[PDB]
Design a binder for this molecule. Sequence first.
Ligand SMILES: [Mg+2]
Ligand SMILES: [Mg+2]
Ligand SMILES: [Mg+2]
Length: 218
Amino acid sequence: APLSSDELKTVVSVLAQKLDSLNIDYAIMGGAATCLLSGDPNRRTEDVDLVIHVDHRKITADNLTTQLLKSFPSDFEGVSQFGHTIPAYKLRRPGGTVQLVELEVFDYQSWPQRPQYDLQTATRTTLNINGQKVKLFSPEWILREKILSQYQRQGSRKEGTDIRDIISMIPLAVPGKPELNFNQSQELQTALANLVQKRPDLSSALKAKIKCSAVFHN
Ligand SMILES: [Mg+2]
Ligand SMILES: [Mg+2]
Ligand SMILES: [Mg+2]
């Protein structure tokens, strides 16, 4: 079930509380981030995707499952769909029953080919949900991911949502962040060329936020 905006906010505020209490640095990405930054309550998602920072304790994304189940047994339970146990938050509905919300957790050490997961350098932001600080990747970071995604998923059922997500993010971006400088990424240059070919009406709004000499000569 896609989570309502209210529900999503309950899930991430609790997760933020628990990660903070374990002193694990993190940032939320994916549909949750997009939804949290949306002005449209109809934009909804079904799980929470995040990156955590691994330090000397070696609480890797995989190892976090055990730590959550051990420290917060009231709030998390293990879910296994393909013989791999991951943590799910136990979202209580008003009538008292539990709706499981899966957590898709990543770390840089395990994905060296995704330097976007480096929490020490990625451009990031926070939201304050009724007093709780919730850590997210920034709109600039998200837009980079989405520009790539719309090209890689072109012709898929999700293409339209992606493009809608791009359009939502562009105005929240500011210029000058590394994630929106595409001069050293052939793959983002190509993805961007594909986007502005499809949606030339977005070209000036993107150009204001993105540095890419190949496409925008800026
Ligand atoms: Mg997701
Ligand atoms: Mg395990
Ligand atoms: Mg109920």
